[PDB]
Design a protein around this ligand. Structure first.
Ligand SMILES: *C/C=C(\C)c1ccc(-c2ccc(N(C)C)cc2)s1
Length: 133
């Protein structure tokens, strides 16, 4: 399925610190953030997505349209400018963020009835699983 709507609560998190390190996130921020459970809220209507990543320590919101490139500031993550594009490869939603970092973006799919996320930067991959309603 391509339908990713829901409130998604983290069940599993692997190599989140490696991913943050590859983004050069400072030591203090990484050490706190790696401890935390996360929620991902996805509102999806056709190509239009509104996504909210939250924990006790951050809020990172982004809206995008599948197939439409957008210039993006990554704000309180790593304060960088990238050129972002989100597209479908089958039922895997793929984001590529062009800029300073290589292999930066994510892949997201519903293989379960859970949400799977791969966050990538450089040679680092973080893998997460969330459970929905
Ligand atoms: C569709 C999935 C998106 C937009 C994201 C998944 C995780 C994200 C994220 C994780 C961690 C942070 N910080 C500030 C540690 C920000 C965003 S966005």
């Amino acid at each position: 399925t391509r339908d990713q709507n829901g409130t998604w609560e983290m069940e599993s998190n692997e190599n989140f610190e490696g991913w943050m390190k590859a983004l050069d996130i400072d030591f203090a921020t990484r050490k706190i953030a790696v401890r935390l459970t996360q929620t991902l809220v996805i509102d999806q209507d056709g190509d239009n997505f509104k996504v909210k990543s939250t924990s006790t320590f951050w809020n990172y919101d982004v809206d995008f349209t599948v197939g439409v490139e957008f210039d993006e500031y990554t704000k309180s993550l790593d304060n960088r400018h990238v050129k972002a594009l989100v597209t479908w490869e089958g039922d895997v939603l793929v984001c590529v963020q062009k800029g300073e970092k290589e292999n930066r973006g994510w892949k997201k799919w519903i293989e379960q009835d859970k949400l799977y996320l791969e966050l990538t930067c450089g040679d680092q991959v973080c893998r997460q699983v969330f459970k929905k309603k």
